[PDB]
Amino acid sequence: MEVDIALPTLSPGDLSALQRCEGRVVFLETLRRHATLREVALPCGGDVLAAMAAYRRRFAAVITRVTPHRMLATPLGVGGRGQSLVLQNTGPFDLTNGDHVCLVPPLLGDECLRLTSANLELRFPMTLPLAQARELTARVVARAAETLQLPPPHRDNAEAATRSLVLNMIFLLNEGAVILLSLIPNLLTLGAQDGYANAVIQLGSATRELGQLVRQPPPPLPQDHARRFCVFEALEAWIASASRLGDTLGTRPVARVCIFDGPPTVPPGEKAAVVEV
């Protein structure tokens, strides 16, 4: 299954540059074998959140062979978990071995490919390690929620991001959440006896502030609690939710890297062979 992307007549001075694109991923809307290039197209920078959401509806595809006639690309993931392939590292950070990778839209709208031969630009995203993609997504969703390399927001689809956030949050409150909350002083008192206990709680955690500014009584006995227990249901719900938080706001890990012999890290602008998971 290799998709085919045809091209129009371009300038001989631009195929020499587009040919240098052999590891960046494209985002197709459907997966018919033959396809055009005009279909896969993106405007310049703007509303990183919109593109991040669009990166879930459309599925990726890695390109491997370019020809001034057509372009052979690989449907990245729909049915395969072992298609060992190579994609270049167009990310800012440096990715070592055994790292799940993630596609994130580019920042500042600075790096695109203005193709004048046909008047259309393709904004190939960047590949970051999961650990830093998570912090990036977190920072952007926090900034979006705030408004009721620094890019501006859009405030047209900020409603959607803050919405998904507050939904995934409101359905984290539960009859057992109050029982788990009525132990915050009992946790803070442990935050002084042990050092790791103070470690696990951050500095401005907005709970160690709460811990001294109110008091709470023992939680009232709920209904049927002689039969059912609630803290376990709450904990299970939280595991099930948080296991799927990082996806619904950012992008799922698309694949992971693996090497045999050479240097661990692959600095940017380099080809790295990855398995697909």
């Binding site: 459907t30 018919r32 359905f171 409150l173 996806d247 619904t248």
Partner: protein, 327 residues
Amino acid sequence: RARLIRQVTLADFCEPQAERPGLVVLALRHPADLAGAAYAATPPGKNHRDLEEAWLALDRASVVSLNFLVAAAENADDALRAHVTTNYRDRRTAARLERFATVLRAMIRSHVFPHRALHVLGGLLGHVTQDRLASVTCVARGDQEAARTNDMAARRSQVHVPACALMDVDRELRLGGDDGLRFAYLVFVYTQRHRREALRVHVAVSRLPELGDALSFLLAGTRVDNAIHGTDEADAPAAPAAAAAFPAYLFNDPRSARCPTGRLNTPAAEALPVWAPDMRGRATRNSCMYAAYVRLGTVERVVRRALPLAHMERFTWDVGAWEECFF
């Protein structure tokens, strides 16, 4: 090539001589642990042993054909009921279908949802049967027609789904898209109103890798009328006390009552404000559960052709994990 699964079992729910090959089969959990987990899982106010009774009223048998399960739900076209009833050889079958309906309706009432009771296997292709004891064989990965059935009229097969339940999405949502390779999802639809509830089944195909918002909008009426009638039978207290309002004005107050750690038992620290977050009877997540889905594989084409059916086209079996849909 593709790799298969063989599971000897009872000719209770999937009856591999009655249907021809090419239809998905499901694996049914041992009911003992369901009946047990109920004891701790049914919410307050409701019954806590009614699933015990509902199960005891249906007396290992492990598999269940989707062709059989779709009949024992709300949504169904009576032609398929007639087919299952008059075309299954087995004794006492309609009664069993009725009891199974009561079982699933009890399952949703007791907040142990059937999606936590039915893992999905591939499409069956072969079977050898003794008297009321079968050994079905289904694919598990790869594409269906890599197999080899012992029919000798049609060595290969396809995948058949009752067209009454197949709900397309893209042409439904009007994405303006163009049909290429589309995914395939088996989805469940719960509805929760005490002693008046049911379950709806569907088989959904689309290009959408992440259902989420798509079902949240598709099943809008279900989520709406499920969030409000779901907390019923739970004694909520009277009007919430004003002390429940979690005070926020006190975080960045430079002058305020304060208390360092290590003096919190009963000191002269009585001056701290009281706040009693008390949540008793409000809508929990399991209260707003309305749907659950699981990925099945990839599909080229769907054509409708005969009892109405829906032949797949180049189905590639790739089973995924279950998923909740509550928000």
